[PDB]
Amino acid sequence: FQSMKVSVIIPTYNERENLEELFSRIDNALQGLNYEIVVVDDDSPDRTWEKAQELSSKYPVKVIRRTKEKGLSSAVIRGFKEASGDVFVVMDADLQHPPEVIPKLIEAIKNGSDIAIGSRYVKGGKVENWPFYRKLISKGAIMVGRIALPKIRDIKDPVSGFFALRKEVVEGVELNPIGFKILMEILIKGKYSKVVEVPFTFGIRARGESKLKGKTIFEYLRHIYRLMKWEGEIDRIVKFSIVGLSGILVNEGFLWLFVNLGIPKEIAVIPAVELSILNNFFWNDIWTFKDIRRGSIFSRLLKFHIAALSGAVVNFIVYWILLFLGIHYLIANLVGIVLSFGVRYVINRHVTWAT
Ligand SMILES: Nc1nc2c(ncn2[C@@H]2O[C@H](COP(=O)(O)OP(=O)(O)O[C@H]3O[C@H](CO)[C@@H](O)[C@H](O)[C@@H]3O)[C@@H](O)[C@H]2O)c(=O)[nH]1
Ligand SMILES: CCCCCCCCCCCC[N+](C)(C)[O-]
Ligand SMILES: CCCCCCCCCCCC[N+](C)(C)[O-]
Ligand SMILES: CCCCCCCCCCCC[N+](C)(C)[O-]
Numbered sequence: 279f280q281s282m283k284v285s286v287i288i289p290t291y292n293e294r295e296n297l298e299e300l301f302s303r304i305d306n307a308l309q310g311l312n313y314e315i316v317v318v319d320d321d322s323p324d325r326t327w328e329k330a331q332e333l334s335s336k337y338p339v340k341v342i343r344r345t346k347e348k349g350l351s352s353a354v355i356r357g358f359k360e361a362s363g364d365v366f367v368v369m370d371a372d373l374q375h376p377p378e379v380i381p382k383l384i385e386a387i388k389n390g391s392d393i394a395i396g397s398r399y400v401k402g403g404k405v406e407n408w409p410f411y412r413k414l415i416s417k418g419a420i421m422v423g424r425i426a427l428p429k430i431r432d433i434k435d436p437v438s439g440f441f442a443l444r445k446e447v448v449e450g451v452e453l454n455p456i457g458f459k460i461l462m463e464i465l466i467k468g469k470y471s472k473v474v475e476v477p478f479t480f481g482i483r484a485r486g487e488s489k490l491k492g493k494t495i496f497e498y499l500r501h502i503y504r505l506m507k508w509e510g511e512i513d514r515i516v517k518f519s520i521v522g523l524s525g526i527l528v529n530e531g532f533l534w535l536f537v538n539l540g541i542p543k544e545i546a547v548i549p550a551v552e553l554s555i556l557n558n559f560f561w562n563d564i565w566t567f568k569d570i571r572r573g574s575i576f577s578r579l580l581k582f583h584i585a586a587l588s589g590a591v592v593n594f595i596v597y598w599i600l601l602f603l604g605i606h607y608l609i610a611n612l613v614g615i616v617l618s619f620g621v622r623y624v625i626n627r628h629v630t631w632a633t
């Protein structure tokens with residue numbers, strides 16, 4: 279069936295030796311299928327944009343040197359533009375991504391997926407010769423993206439550099455050239471309805487020096503912030519905070535009201551807090567999250583209470599922990615309130631008004 283063309287897009291920088299075993303193993307895996315390889319190199323000081331060209335005699339290889347421009351994600355944007363295939367496959371040259379599972383990816387694409395991800399962390403997936411501290415900071419950094427961007431909540435490896443997509447997913451789509459996480463840009467900005475994750479084994483880099491670890495992590499946070507903006511999440515947070523402020527005022531306003539109406543001070547505290555909670559729920563349901571209301575309004579009210587109490591507990595715990603650590607009590611109080619706002623937001627976005 280793959281008379282339809284597959285472009286295998288490979289960003290390189292000082293990859294050398296691998297080309298031989300890379301192209302060999304790719305060809306073996308994609309035997310007799312219609313495919314091209316699209317190497318996009320940013321003027322390596324080291325030997326190839328042109329070592330790849332001598333292998334053009336043995337392999338269907340198109341080579342691109344960008345000399346004005348530089349960057350991993352940027353290279354893949356370029357590879358998209360220059361590829362002529364129906365299906366794009368993206369991967370690294372160092373053989374950490376095994377060409378032998380490329381068939382499983384395109385197979386997933388043929389079966390109806392718009393996007394097939396090579397995933398270290400789905401059932402079956404592996405990453406060999408890694409400490410578990412290393413593996414968990416990885417899943418940790420990922421979890422930050424899965425929580426901050428509800429759209430990729432169910433994607434266990436959205437930072438993977440190993441994936442396939444139908445050409446249509448990225449056609450007419452403007453992808454941000456900054457960074458290292460092109461897959462994440464696509465999951466947020468691309469056109470698709472089905473994504474699957476395909477287990478594979480992350481291999482040891484056979485040969486050559488490492489050009490990323492570690493520059494990625496800060497860019498990755500800056501990237502998540504850019505995506506949060508694009509997705510409307512930053513705008514929801516600002517409204518949620520504005521509504522939060524109104525709640526603090528309403529809480530005090532009823533508290534003052536109840537003491538001059540006869541009600542004792544610590545019996546008054548509770549109706550005051552409940553009214554502030556209800557106030558906060560009302561404005562969030564018709565403003566902050568007006569567009570993603572589901573089910574009964576009572577079910578959401580109840581869940582909103584869980585998020586409010588969770589916020590209160592987090593505020594309590596964080597505060598006392600910072601005091602024991604010797605932080606000034608006003609900083610401790612400020613961090614308390616901000617972490618409580620963050621946790622309330624997350625639980626509301628993911629539970630109360632989940633998408
Ligand atoms: N044109 C161009 N190509 C690059 C650049 N940087 C790297 N490439 C190529 O992109 C690949 C990544 O370099 P590695 O040194 O192997 O990175 P890694 O640490 O193994 O990271 C991989 O795993 C991460 C998640 O585990 C991925 O997020 C990451 O993108 C990559 O797949 C290599 O093929 C490398 O030649 C660049 O700046 N410009
Ligand atoms: C605490 C400083 C922030 C003040 C902003 C107060 C709320 C902004 C106005 C939002 C209402 C506008 N609109 C169109 C939704 O009605
Ligand atoms: C579509 C309805 C628009 C709702 C307008 C925005 C409501 C914000 C109300 C809370 C603001 C009160 N406060 C204290 C911040 O001024
Ligand atoms: C069942 C007892 C409940 C005790 C926990 C106290 C709840 C505090 C809720 C804080 C919310 C106040 N505010 C201003 C953010 O709305």
Ligand SMILES: CCCCCCCCCCCC[N+](C)(C)[O-]
Pocket residue numbers: 528531532534535
């Ligand atoms: C939510 C109900 C609104 C009640 C209005 C309360 C008026 C503010 C209280 C007067 C201010 C007195 N004090 C002690 C704060 O200076």
Ligand SMILES: CCCCCCCCCCCC[N+](C)(C)[O-]
Pocket residue numbers: 595598599
């Ligand atoms: C992991 C939860 C941490 C809870 C911290 C408990 C607070 C300790 C309070 C010490 C002094 C306050 N007081 C009045 C009880 O003495």
Ligand SMILES: [Cl-]
Pocket residue numbers: 522525558586622
């Ligand atoms: Cl709240």
Ligand SMILES: [Mn+2]
Pocket residue numbers: 370372374483
């Ligand atoms: Mn690598």
